[PDB]
Write an enzyme that holds these catalytic residues in place. Structure first.
Site, PDB file in Angstrom:
ATOM      1  N   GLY A 204      35.432  26.300  81.074  1.00 35.16           N
ATOM      2  CA  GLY A 204      34.410  27.319  81.221  1.00 35.16           C
ATOM      3  C   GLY A 204      34.982  28.717  81.272  1.00 35.16           C
TER       4      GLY A 204
ATOM      5  N   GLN B 273      39.040  32.481  82.938  1.00 38.39           N
ATOM      6  CA  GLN B 273      39.366  33.805  83.453  1.00 38.39           C
ATOM      7  C   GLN B 273      40.177  33.716  84.737  1.00 38.39           C
ATOM      8  OE1 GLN B 273      36.343  36.733  83.670  1.00 38.39           O
ATOM      9  NE2 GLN B 273      35.828  36.621  81.494  1.00 38.39           N
TER      10      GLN B 273
ATOM     11  N   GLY C 210      27.281  27.725  85.224  1.00 36.34           N
ATOM     12  CA  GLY C 210      26.828  27.382  83.860  1.00 36.34           C
ATOM     13  C   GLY C 210      26.714  25.886  83.627  1.00 36.34           C
TER      14      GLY C 210
ATOM     15  N   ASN D 285      38.035  38.599  89.801  1.00 35.39           N
ATOM     16  CA  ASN D 285      38.937  37.634  89.195  1.00 35.39           C
ATOM     17  C   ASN D 285      40.342  37.770  89.768  1.00 35.39           C
ATOM     18  OD1 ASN D 285      39.903  35.676  87.528  1.00 35.39           O
ATOM     19  ND2 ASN D 285      39.473  36.752  85.613  1.00 35.39           N
TER      20      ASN D 285
ATOM     21  N   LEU E 117      49.365  16.823  97.266  1.00 37.27           N
ATOM     22  CA  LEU E 117      47.912  16.696  97.261  1.00 37.27           C
ATOM     23  C   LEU E 117      47.461  15.571  98.180  1.00 37.27           C
ATOM     24  CD1 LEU E 117      47.662  16.991  93.404  1.00 37.27           C
ATOM     25  CD2 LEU E 117      47.659  18.811  95.101  1.00 37.27           C
TER      26      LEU E 117
ATOM     27  N   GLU F  36      48.975  14.850 100.782  1.00 38.92           N
ATOM     28  CA  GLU F  36      49.086  15.412 102.114  1.00 38.92           C
ATOM     29  C   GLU F  36      47.924  16.347 102.399  1.00 38.92           C
ATOM     30  OE1 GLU F  36      52.763  17.368 102.782  1.00 38.92           O
ATOM     31  OE2 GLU F  36      52.352  17.807 104.890  1.00 38.92           O
TER      32      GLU F  36
HETATM   33  N1  LIG Z   1      35.217  34.461  85.515  1.00 38.58           N
HETATM   34  C1  LIG Z   1      34.163  34.596  86.327  1.00 38.58           C
HETATM   35  N2  LIG Z   1      33.061  33.875  86.119  1.00 38.58           N
HETATM   36  C2  LIG Z   1      32.095  34.136  87.031  1.00 38.58           C
HETATM   37  C3  LIG Z   1      32.144  35.026  88.080  1.00 38.58           C
HETATM   38  N3  LIG Z   1      30.951  35.013  88.789  1.00 38.58           N
HETATM   39  C4  LIG Z   1      30.220  34.119  88.174  1.00 38.58           C
HETATM   40  N4  LIG Z   1      30.842  33.565  87.086  1.00 38.58           N
HETATM   41  C5  LIG Z   1      30.297  32.497  86.262  1.00 38.58           C
HETATM   42  O1  LIG Z   1      30.842  32.497  84.972  1.00 38.58           O
HETATM   43  C6  LIG Z   1      30.089  31.479  84.274  1.00 38.58           C
HETATM   44  C7  LIG Z   1      30.257  31.616  82.783  1.00 38.58           C
HETATM   45  O2  LIG Z   1      30.957  30.452  82.279  1.00 38.58           O
HETATM   46  P1  LIG Z   1      30.155  29.077  82.126  1.00 38.58           P
HETATM   47  O3  LIG Z   1      29.466  28.754  83.406  1.00 38.58           O
HETATM   48  O4  LIG Z   1      31.038  28.041  81.522  1.00 38.58           O
HETATM   49  O5  LIG Z   1      29.059  29.469  81.034  1.00 38.58           O
HETATM   50  P2  LIG Z   1      28.363  28.547  79.931  1.00 38.58           P
HETATM   51  O6  LIG Z   1      27.110  29.207  79.472  1.00 38.58           O
HETATM   52  O7  LIG Z   1      28.315  27.157  80.450  1.00 38.58           O
HETATM   53  O8  LIG Z   1      29.452  28.622  78.766  1.00 38.58           O
HETATM   54  P3  LIG Z   1      30.391  29.854  78.346  1.00 38.58           P
HETATM   55  O9  LIG Z   1      29.562  31.092  78.571  1.00 38.58           O
HETATM   56  O10 LIG Z   1      30.760  29.650  76.900  1.00 38.58           O
HETATM   57  O11 LIG Z   1      31.577  29.780  79.262  1.00 38.58           O
HETATM   58  C8  LIG Z   1      28.660  31.597  84.825  1.00 38.58           C
HETATM   59  O12 LIG Z   1      28.200  30.315  85.221  1.00 38.58           O
HETATM   60  C9  LIG Z   1      28.793  32.530  86.036  1.00 38.58           C
HETATM   61  O13 LIG Z   1      28.125  32.031  87.173  1.00 38.58           O
HETATM   62  C10 LIG Z   1      33.315  35.793  88.293  1.00 38.58           C
HETATM   63  O14 LIG Z   1      33.541  36.613  89.191  1.00 38.58           O
HETATM   64  N5  LIG Z   1      34.300  35.494  87.353  1.00 38.58           N
END
Ligand SMILES: Nc1nc2c(ncn2[C@@H]2O[C@H](COP(=O)(O)OP(=O)(O)OP(=O)(O)O)[C@@H](O)[C@H]2O)c(=O)[nH]1
Ligand SMILES: COc1ccc(C[C@@H]2NC(=O)/C=C\C[C@@H]([C@H](C)[C@H]3O[C@@H]3c3ccccc3)OC(=O)[C@H](CC(C)C)OC(=O)C(C)(C)CNC2=O)cc1Cl
Ligand SMILES: Nc1nc2c(ncn2[C@@H]2O[C@H](COP(=O)(O)OP(=O)(O)O)[C@@H](O)[C@H]2O)c(=O)[nH]1
EC number: 3.6.5.-
Lengths: 430, 436
Positions: free
Chosen positions: B10, B15, B143, B228, B252, B254
């Site tokens: 995801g 990230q 997501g 992040n 792990l 542990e």
């Molecule tokens: N990297 C990151 N993601 C966050 C943060 N806060 C929320 N997200 C989440 O980032 C997610 C985006 O990735 P996914 O959940 O995989 O989204 P998806 O629609 O399933 O698929 P993609 O957008 O292709 O990744 C969302 O569900 C957000 O809730 C944050 O601070 N950093």
């Protein structure tokens, strides 16, 4: 994202969508000659959403224009940015499409559905992946309502997976020469509810009302209102066209927005109401945008949402803007209007922010809601239909053209049941 | 001598992994061109940093992790970010279309046609390993890709490897950065099908990380590079135990033993204290007693829940630099002031401590600056039921009038799944509430 195929129906569709193509093409900074003028990559981050490369890696809009009144081709090739399109999809009829259903729905048009599927498949061959469709049309006349519903059903058959979105224009007594409209409108929305994924109610009644009572124009023409709708639907498309934090997509917009499995009629709105100007403008600033976003005389449906409830909300703000300020006022608006919104989905009022200003205005936005007020519009249309229908009227045209009375009766049953559904979801509780 | 494999699913997962792997480079002195002068450049290792880098004969120190995304929008960014040359010729995973906030689309429709490739990649990586402890997966409850595909991955892994454990790091998505409204269905539908194949899972709430960054970091616009980075720092701090060298909490296994009593209760809560604001050169000095005093403040935990209402299981700790165990004993004596502390009658108590003799590493040009001492209390509280109750309220509201249900039913899920998962989460929250 994947590519989008745009479909344009009838005189209203062709005019409204040609102006929309002009609006966004200026927004994405592309020359009529296909020459490149944009000065940054943020303009072409999502140019592939619509435009496709030429042999000279020259970006070309991808759209199809459909009608049967053969006088529209020259209207296409006589606009300012009209000759922009590929000389392969100017396919039209040859003997007029008088505003009668089952002529474009059953009698003919059904003979050229092969042609239109051929062209749409032909240009989706060059599409690496398909996202959805953009059918622009209106609810009156064959080319328009009937062809639109026929196309919707056909591509739903051929592509059951992808999304299917369309813009609806509902003709109104206030500006309408013919009178066979309500039959067309109801016959349309019956197919439309059960065969599309989401739809925009770009009304004419509210359009004329606000344009004459505040904008106060003498003769609302196919010029002014074309400009209004082209601008607003450009604003709707921006969110996909732009890269956003609320990085929404068509499927994502459906998932976020769609509350029930038959209530996908939106109410596109716009806060800074704009006429045909020349200079930059008289200045508008944040709190003005906040207030005019959700006023009572700025949407495109003659309804007051305070008499109803929102299933969901959405916005897309424009121009250089204070994000924290925006979030503060939105939190207040969801705080000071507790009863205004449904209690079924907390965290519904979503917000995004964009950067490129509208080509002419400094700070604006784009309202794409989903209310329970749309029952007023549907009830209006259905009542006028049944007033025209209690005693027969021109209905011999339809019956001799192929329908029967039962189809009309079931269309009314379906519409009144839909109004009942909206009423029901409008009177929930906790 | 004990290999380790991690995996990113995801956008959030990838990230976070991007933000963590370069921290991991920094900690050991690893640099995109680094060579760690005490090695033979041919497997020179078997120390606690071998668990991640399986360094090759080119003296490259390539890692053990892959990234998953249903549509390339972030995985490409790491493929063309900063440490480009740090990854194999297309070892990563790229798709063509996201699940689009739909748990079902990643759980039944899309992932069920891509998962076999992911498992093949995981197995191929694991073959080069010798003594793998388990997996460390990074996902989010928000997501449908980072949630449906994660649960499906859990099932597949537990099918192919049940003996090995697999720690988890999760995000409890917040309304503040809510990029959807269908998160709660995904969250319930992921927690319900996670338990039977989970062993220990950490949730880091973007509500909490957002609050920390906006308040104590002097940032008002927390992009996916600020929150992040902060989360990357926390993750590196927690896994430093196995990462740098040997002390408390080596393995792990542990982790489980000294953390999780009851397999239905395996969500440890992590607290932190040193929240260095910015390039601010001078504020004051610092004391170890001060940071361990701060590690009890409810405002400074990775998930919002006030623990003065409940009892702890096992409150482990870690430290960086400046060993002084007598001060630690004094700290325990002070916190014994019983104003906001508790333990459980059945089992005695242990505040196990492990010291790392390296000062904490910092992002060079980030929103932080280098400090000398650090600490992170992983208190397995009973208060972690607040998050589940809060999410249950919203799931119940949305399921009252069957909202959005079609978007799940019409894709390969039944209607009974929602109800049974709701009942199962009810049982889980009962299982927390009864302990006491
Ligand atoms: N990297 C990151 N993601 C966050 C943060 N806060 C929320 N997200 C989440 O980032 C997610 C985006 O990735 P996914 O959940 O995989 O989204 P998806 O629609 O399933 O698929 P993609 O957008 O292709 O990744 C969302 O569900 C957000 O809730 C944050 O601070 N950093
Ligand atoms: C009670 O008697 C009345 C009589 C007239 C009026 C207003 C009168 N009426 C209508 O015809 C309106 C809809 C009936 C449809 C019918 C129902 C559709 O099947 C038509 C059709 C089309 C083509 C071929 C075969 C069939 O016809 C038309 O739209 C045609 C278009 C065509 C003929 C060019 O005409 C017009 O569009 C007009 C005449 C320019 C529009 N204007 C009018 O002032 C009001 C009343 Cl109350
Ligand atoms: N051309 C045009 N028509 C509009 C617009 N807005 C509403 N309409 C109405 O849409 C209807 C036109 O239907 P049309 O598509 O011409 O049917 P056709 O004759 O089958 O092509 C008329 O009732 C117009 O009043 C607009 O902006 N442009």
């Amino acid at each position: 994202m994947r590519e989008i195929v745009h479909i344009q129906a009838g005189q209203c569709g062709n005019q409204i969508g040609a102006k929309f193509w002009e609006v966004i093409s200026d927004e994405h900074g592309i020359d009529p000659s296909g020459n490149y003028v944009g000065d940054s990559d943020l303009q072409l981050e999502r140019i592939s959403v619509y435009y496709n490369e030429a042999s000279s890696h020259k970006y070309v809009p991808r759209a199809i224009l459909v009608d049967l009144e053969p006088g529209t081709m020259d209207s296409v090739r006589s606009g300012a940015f009209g000759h922009l399109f590929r000389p392969d999809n100017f396919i039209f009829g040859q003997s007029g499409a008088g505003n009668n259903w089952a002529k474009g729905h059953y009698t003919e048009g059904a003979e050229l559905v092969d042609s239109v599927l051929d062209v749409v498949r032909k240009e989706c061959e060059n599409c690496d992946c398909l996202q959805g469709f953009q059918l622009t049309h209106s609810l009156g006349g064959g080319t328009g309502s009937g062809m639109g519903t026929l196309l919707i059903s056909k591509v739903r058959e051929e592509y059951p997976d992808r999304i299917m979105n369309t813009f609806s224009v509902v003709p109104s007594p206030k500006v309408s020469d013919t009178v066979v409209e309500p039959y067309n409108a109801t016959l349309s929305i019956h197919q439309l509810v059960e065969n599309t994924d989401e739809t925009y109610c770009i009304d004419n009644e509210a359009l004329y009302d606000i344009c004459f009572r505040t904008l106060k124009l003498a003769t609302p023409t196919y010029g002014d209102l074309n400009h209004l709708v082209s601008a607003t639907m450009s604003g709707v498309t921006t969110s996909l066209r732009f890269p956003g934090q609320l990085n929404a997509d068509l499927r994502k917009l459906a998932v976020n927005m769609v509350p029930f499995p038959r209530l996908h009629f939106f109410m596109p709105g716009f806060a800074p109401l704009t006429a045909r100007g020349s200079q930059q403008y008289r200045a508008l600033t944040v709190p003005e945008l906040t207030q005019q976003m959700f006023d009572a005389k700025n949407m495109m449906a003659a309804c007051d949402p305070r008499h109803g409830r929102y299933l969901t909300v959405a916005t897309v703000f424009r121009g250089r803007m204070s994000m924290k300020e925006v979030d503060e006022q939105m939190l207040a608006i969801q705080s000071k209007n507790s009863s205004y919104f449904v209690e079924w989905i907390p965290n519904n009022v979503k917000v995004a922010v964009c950067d490129i200003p509208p080509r002419g205005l400094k700070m604006s936005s784009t309202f794409i809601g989903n209310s329970t007020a749309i029952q007023e519009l549907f009830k209006r249309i259905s009542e006028q239909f049944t007033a025209m229908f209690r005693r027969k009227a021109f209905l011999h045209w339809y019956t001799g053209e192929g329908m029967d009375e039962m189809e009309f009766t079931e269309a009314e049953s379906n519409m009144n049941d839909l109004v009942s559904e909206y009423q029901q979801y409008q009177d929930a509780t906790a | 001598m004990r290999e380790c494999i991690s995996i990113h699913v995801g956008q959030a997962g990838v990230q976070i992994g991007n933000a963590c792997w370069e921290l991991y480079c920094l900690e050991h002195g690893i640099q995109p061109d680094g060579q760690m002068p005490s090695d033979k450049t041919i497997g020179g290792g078997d120390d606690s940093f071998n668990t991640f880098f399986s360094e090759t004969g080119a003296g490259k120190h390539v890692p053990r992790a892959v990234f998953v995304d249903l549509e390339p929008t972030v995985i490409d960014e790491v493929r063309t970010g900063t440490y480009r040359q740090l990854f194999h010729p297309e070892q990563l995973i790229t798709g063509k279309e996201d699940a689009a906030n739909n748990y079902a689309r990643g759980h039944y429709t899309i992932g069920k046609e891509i998962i076999d490739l992911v498992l093949d990649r995981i197995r191929k990586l694991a073959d080069q390993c010798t003594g793998l402890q388990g997996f460390l997966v990074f996902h989010s409850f928000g997501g449908g890709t980072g949630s449906g595909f994660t649960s499906l991955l859990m099932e597949r892994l537990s099918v192919d490897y049940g003996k090995k454990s697999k720690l988890e790091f999760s995000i409890y998505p917040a309304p503040q950065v809510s990029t959807a409204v269908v998160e709660p269905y995904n969250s319930i539908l992921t927690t319900h099908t996670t338990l039977e194949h989970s062993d220990c899972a950490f949730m880091v709430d973007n509500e909490a990380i957002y609050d920390i960054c906006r308040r104590n970091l002097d940032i008002e616009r927390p992009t996916y590079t600020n929150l992040n980075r902060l989360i990357s720092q926390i993750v590196s701090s927690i896994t430093a135990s196995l990462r740098f060298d040997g002390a408390l909490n080596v393995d792990l296994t542990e982790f489980q033993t000294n953390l999780v009593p009851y397999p239905r209760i395996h969500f440890p809560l992590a607290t932190y204290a040193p929240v260095i604001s910015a390039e601010k050169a001078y504020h004051e000095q610092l004391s170890v007693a001060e940071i361990t005093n701060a590690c009890f403040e409810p405002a400074n935990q990775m998930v919002k829940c006030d623990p003065r209402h409940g009892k702890y299981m096992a409150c482990c700790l870690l430290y960086r630099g400046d060993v002084v165990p007598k001060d630690v004993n004094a700290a325990i004596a002070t916190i014994k002031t019983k104003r906001s502390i508790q333990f459980v009658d059945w089992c005695p108590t242990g505040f196990k401590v492990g010291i790392n003799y390296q000062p904490p590493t910092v992002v060079p040009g980030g929103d932080l600056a280098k400090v000398q001492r650090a600490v992170c209390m992983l208190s397995n509280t009973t208060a972690i039921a607040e998050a589940w109750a809060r999410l249950d309220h919203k799931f119940d509201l949305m399921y009252a009038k069957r909202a959005f249900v079609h978007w799940y039913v019409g894709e390969g899920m039944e209607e009974g799944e929602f109800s049974e998962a709701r009942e199962d989460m009810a049982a889980l929250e009962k299982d927390y509430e009864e302990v006491g």
